Design a protein around this motif. Structure first.
Motif, PDB file in Angstrom:
ATOM      1  N   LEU A 195      71.674  33.304  70.489  1.00 27.48           N
ATOM      2  CA  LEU A 195      71.009  33.196  69.198  1.00 27.48           C
ATOM      3  C   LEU A 195      71.498  32.014  68.349  1.00 27.48           C
ATOM      4  O   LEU A 195      71.372  32.030  67.130  1.00 27.48           O
ATOM      5  CB  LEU A 195      71.168  34.516  68.449  1.00 27.48           C
ATOM      6  N   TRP A 196      72.021  30.984  69.010  1.00 29.39           N
ATOM      7  CA  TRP A 196      72.433  29.739  68.338  1.00 29.39           C
ATOM      8  C   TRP A 196      71.236  28.975  67.747  1.00 29.39           C
ATOM      9  O   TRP A 196      71.354  28.304  66.718  1.00 29.39           O
ATOM     10  CB  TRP A 196      73.181  28.845  69.319  1.00 29.39           C
ATOM     11  N   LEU A 208      58.356  33.472  68.767  1.00 30.50           N
ATOM     12  CA  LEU A 208      59.690  33.967  68.445  1.00 30.50           C
ATOM     13  C   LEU A 208      59.913  35.393  68.954  1.00 30.50           C
ATOM     14  O   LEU A 208      59.154  36.292  68.613  1.00 30.50           O
ATOM     15  CB  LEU A 208      59.825  33.945  66.917  1.00 30.50           C
ATOM     16  N   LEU A 209      60.948  35.605  69.766  1.00 31.58           N
ATOM     17  CA  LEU A 209      61.387  36.963  70.120  1.00 31.58           C
ATOM     18  C   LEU A 209      62.067  37.590  68.916  1.00 31.58           C
ATOM     19  O   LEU A 209      63.180  37.208  68.582  1.00 31.58           O
ATOM     20  CB  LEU A 209      62.352  36.942  71.310  1.00 31.58           C
ATOM     21  N   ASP A 210      61.397  38.554  68.270  1.00 36.13           N
ATOM     22  CA  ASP A 210      61.758  38.977  66.913  1.00 36.13           C
ATOM     23  C   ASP A 210      62.003  40.488  66.759  1.00 36.13           C
ATOM     24  O   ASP A 210      61.071  41.261  66.507  1.00 36.13           O
ATOM     25  CB  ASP A 210      60.661  38.534  65.938  1.00 36.13           C
ATOM     26  N   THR A 211      63.275  40.880  66.835  1.00 35.38           N
ATOM     27  CA  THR A 211      63.672  42.283  66.712  1.00 35.38           C
ATOM     28  C   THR A 211      63.431  42.865  65.319  1.00 35.38           C
ATOM     29  O   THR A 211      63.369  44.089  65.157  1.00 35.38           O
ATOM     30  CB  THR A 211      65.159  42.486  67.095  1.00 35.38           C
ATOM     31  N   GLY A 212      63.301  41.998  64.315  1.00 32.27           N
ATOM     32  CA  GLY A 212      62.987  42.423  62.950  1.00 32.27           C
ATOM     33  C   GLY A 212      61.499  42.634  62.698  1.00 32.27           C
ATOM     34  O   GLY A 212      61.114  43.057  61.601  1.00 32.27           O
ATOM     35  N   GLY A 270      56.141  40.665  55.081  1.00 33.30           N
ATOM     36  CA  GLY A 270      57.197  39.730  55.426  1.00 33.30           C
ATOM     37  C   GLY A 270      58.134  39.576  54.242  1.00 33.30           C
ATOM     38  O   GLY A 270      58.117  40.389  53.321  1.00 33.30           O
ATOM     39  N   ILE A 271      58.951  38.532  54.242  1.00 31.16           N
ATOM     40  CA  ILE A 271      59.992  38.442  53.220  1.00 31.16           C
ATOM     41  C   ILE A 271      59.424  38.194  51.819  1.00 31.16           C
ATOM     42  O   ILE A 271      60.023  38.621  50.829  1.00 31.16           O
ATOM     43  CB  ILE A 271      61.094  37.417  53.582  1.00 31.16           C
ATOM     44  N   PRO A 323      53.240  31.773  59.640  1.00 32.25           N
ATOM     45  CA  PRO A 323      53.741  30.405  59.834  1.00 32.25           C
ATOM     46  C   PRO A 323      54.345  30.151  61.223  1.00 32.25           C
ATOM     47  O   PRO A 323      54.391  29.012  61.679  1.00 32.25           O
ATOM     48  CB  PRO A 323      54.815  30.262  58.740  1.00 32.25           C
ATOM     49  N   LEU A 335      68.974  45.449  59.086  1.00 32.16           N
ATOM     50  CA  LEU A 335      68.207  45.176  60.283  1.00 32.16           C
ATOM     51  C   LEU A 335      68.840  44.030  61.065  1.00 32.16           C
ATOM     52  O   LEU A 335      69.060  42.953  60.507  1.00 32.16           O
ATOM     53  CB  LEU A 335      66.797  44.793  59.849  1.00 32.16           C
ATOM     54  N   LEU A 336      69.147  44.261  62.339  1.00 31.91           N
ATOM     55  CA  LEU A 336      69.572  43.184  63.231  1.00 31.91           C
ATOM     56  C   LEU A 336      68.340  42.392  63.649  1.00 31.91           C
ATOM     57  O   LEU A 336      67.530  42.871  64.436  1.00 31.91           O
ATOM     58  CB  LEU A 336      70.275  43.737  64.470  1.00 31.91           C
ATOM     59  N   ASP A 337      68.209  41.192  63.105  1.00 33.78           N
ATOM     60  CA  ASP A 337      66.958  40.454  63.115  1.00 33.78           C
ATOM     61  C   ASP A 337      67.106  39.097  63.808  1.00 33.78           C
ATOM     62  O   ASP A 337      67.497  38.112  63.187  1.00 33.78           O
ATOM     63  CB  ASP A 337      66.479  40.271  61.668  1.00 33.78           C
ATOM     64  N   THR A 338      66.704  39.038  65.080  1.00 32.61           N
ATOM     65  CA  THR A 338      66.730  37.779  65.843  1.00 32.61           C
ATOM     66  C   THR A 338      65.697  36.779  65.318  1.00 32.61           C
ATOM     67  O   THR A 338      65.774  35.590  65.604  1.00 32.61           O
ATOM     68  CB  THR A 338      66.465  38.012  67.338  1.00 32.61           C
ATOM     69  N   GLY A 339      64.723  37.267  64.560  1.00 27.21           N
ATOM     70  CA  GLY A 339      63.726  36.407  63.942  1.00 27.21           C
ATOM     71  C   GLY A 339      64.123  35.835  62.595  1.00 27.21           C
ATOM     72  O   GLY A 339      63.320  35.179  61.946  1.00 27.21           O
ATOM     73  N   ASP A 382      66.749  33.295  60.571  1.00 28.48           N
ATOM     74  CA  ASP A 382      67.803  32.268  60.606  1.00 28.48           C
ATOM     75  C   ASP A 382      69.021  32.694  59.784  1.00 28.48           C
ATOM     76  O   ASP A 382      70.170  32.342  60.105  1.00 28.48           O
ATOM     77  CB  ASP A 382      67.325  30.936  60.011  1.00 28.48           C
ATOM     78  N   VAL A 392      70.057  38.053  54.700  1.00 31.32           N
ATOM     79  CA  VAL A 392      69.597  38.300  53.348  1.00 31.32           C
ATOM     80  C   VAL A 392      69.745  39.780  53.008  1.00 31.32           C
ATOM     81  O   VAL A 392      69.205  40.636  53.701  1.00 31.32           O
ATOM     82  CB  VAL A 392      68.100  37.915  53.146  1.00 31.32           C
ATOM     83  N   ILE A 431      63.752  30.715  49.767  1.00 30.37           N
ATOM     84  CA  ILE A 431      63.381  30.868  51.176  1.00 30.37           C
ATOM     85  C   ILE A 431      61.935  31.371  51.295  1.00 30.37           C
ATOM     86  O   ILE A 431      61.478  32.224  50.521  1.00 30.37           O
ATOM     87  CB  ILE A 431      64.364  31.808  51.943  1.00 30.37           C
ATOM     88  N   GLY A 483      58.802  32.761  53.949  1.00 24.67           N
ATOM     89  CA  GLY A 483      58.361  33.301  55.232  1.00 24.67           C
ATOM     90  C   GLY A 483      56.967  33.891  55.147  1.00 24.67           C
ATOM     91  O   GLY A 483      56.089  33.352  54.479  1.00 24.67           O
ATOM     92  N   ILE A 484      56.746  34.988  55.865  1.00 23.76           N
ATOM     93  CA  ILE A 484      55.463  35.674  55.806  1.00 23.76           C
ATOM     94  C   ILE A 484      55.320  36.262  54.398  1.00 23.76           C
ATOM     95  O   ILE A 484      56.240  36.907  53.901  1.00 23.76           O
ATOM     96  CB  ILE A 484      55.336  36.730  56.930  1.00 23.76           C
ATOM     97  N   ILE A 509      68.824  42.306  55.861  1.00 20.35           N
ATOM     98  CA  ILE A 509      68.580  41.596  57.102  1.00 20.35           C
ATOM     99  C   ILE A 509      69.848  40.880  57.552  1.00 20.35           C
ATOM    100  O   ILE A 509      70.410  40.092  56.794  1.00 20.35           O
ATOM    101  CB  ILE A 509      67.402  40.577  56.923  1.00 20.35           C
ATOM    102  N   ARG A 521      70.638  35.411  62.463  1.00 24.99           N
ATOM    103  CA  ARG A 521      71.326  34.741  63.551  1.00 24.99           C
ATOM    104  C   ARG A 521      72.692  34.158  63.174  1.00 24.99           C
ATOM    105  O   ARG A 521      73.577  34.112  64.018  1.00 24.99           O
ATOM    106  CB  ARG A 521      70.438  33.649  64.157  1.00 24.99           C
ATOM    107  N   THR A 562      75.392  35.736  65.907  1.00 26.70           N
ATOM    108  CA  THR A 562      76.143  34.918  66.845  1.00 26.70           C
ATOM    109  C   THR A 562      77.651  35.133  66.670  1.00 26.70           C
ATOM    110  O   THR A 562      78.384  35.081  67.647  1.00 26.70           O
ATOM    111  CB  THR A 562      75.840  33.400  66.714  1.00 26.70           C
TER     112      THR A 562
END
Ligand SMILES: Cc1cccc(C)c1OCC(=O)N[C@@H](Cc1ccccc1)[C@@H](O)C[C@H](Cc1ccccc1)NC(=O)[C@H](C(C)C)N1CCCNC1=O
Lengths: 99, 99
Positions: A5-6, A23-27, A49-50, A81, B23-27, B29, B32, B47, B49-50, B84, B87, B91
């Motif tokens: 996840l770098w 995007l592989l997105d667990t959230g 979304g956010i 987006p 939430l563990l969120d891979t989507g 960056d 928050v 920031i 997003g959606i 949230i 990443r 990491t």
């Protein structure tokens, strides 16, 4: 595969002749892609979304290939987006978080 | 741990002696968290997003414990709909996606 996840976990997905970067997105509970004329019935839906909500079209039982793994299920289409593969499909390709 | 995705990957975190669900969120960056008081000199940040943009407060080098794994990094605080873990911290605790 193992995916670190770098950077954003972006992968190639395939749906009915179209290739996209997603995007592989667990959230994300569900999967949303921008701009595509899927076949079949759909129904309107709002996803959060956010910053608030966007309106999407919900298509069910859509075959999608993700990193060579076949899946089938609900695909939302709307003004995201970034193309997002959510939990509904992540589970289908056997994806887990590990630490 | 291994966390599957049939349910939202919500886990308990500890920050400043406070327990919260995040939430563990891979989507994401960034990390928050919902509105809270943290000590230190924060920087105003936006920031998007959606659903659009939110105003957040950026705190640097904040210790956070995620499922007993220690991280120290940047935490944004604002009107996110859900806590949230992004990443930048995932990491640090050795989290990967696997399938
Ligand atoms: C929650 C949900 C339900 C149904 C369907 C979907 C797609 C759902 O997910 C929508 C969603 O925005 N989920 C977010 C977390 C979420 C879950 C529930 C409510 C609200 C949010 C997050 O995981 C993905 C989303 C992706 C993104 C979109 C546009 C630009 C960039 C990235 N990421 C972001 O917004 C992040 C934030 C969190 C720091 N982000 C925005 C600043 C730039 N970079 C970045 O990484």
């Amino acid at each position: 595969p193992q995916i670190t996840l770098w950077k954003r976990p972006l992968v190639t997905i395939r749906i009915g002749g179209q290739l996209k970067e997603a995007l592989l997105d667990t959230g994300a509970d569900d999967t949303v892609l921008e701009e595509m004329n899927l076949p079949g019935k759909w129904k309107p839906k709002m996803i959060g979304g956010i910053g608030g909500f966007i309106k999407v079209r919900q298509y069910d039982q859509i075959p999608i290939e993700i990193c060579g793994h076949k899946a089938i299920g609900t695909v939302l289409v709307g003004p995201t987006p970034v193309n997002i593969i959510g939990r509904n499909l992540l589970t289908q390709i056997g994806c887990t978080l590990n630490f």
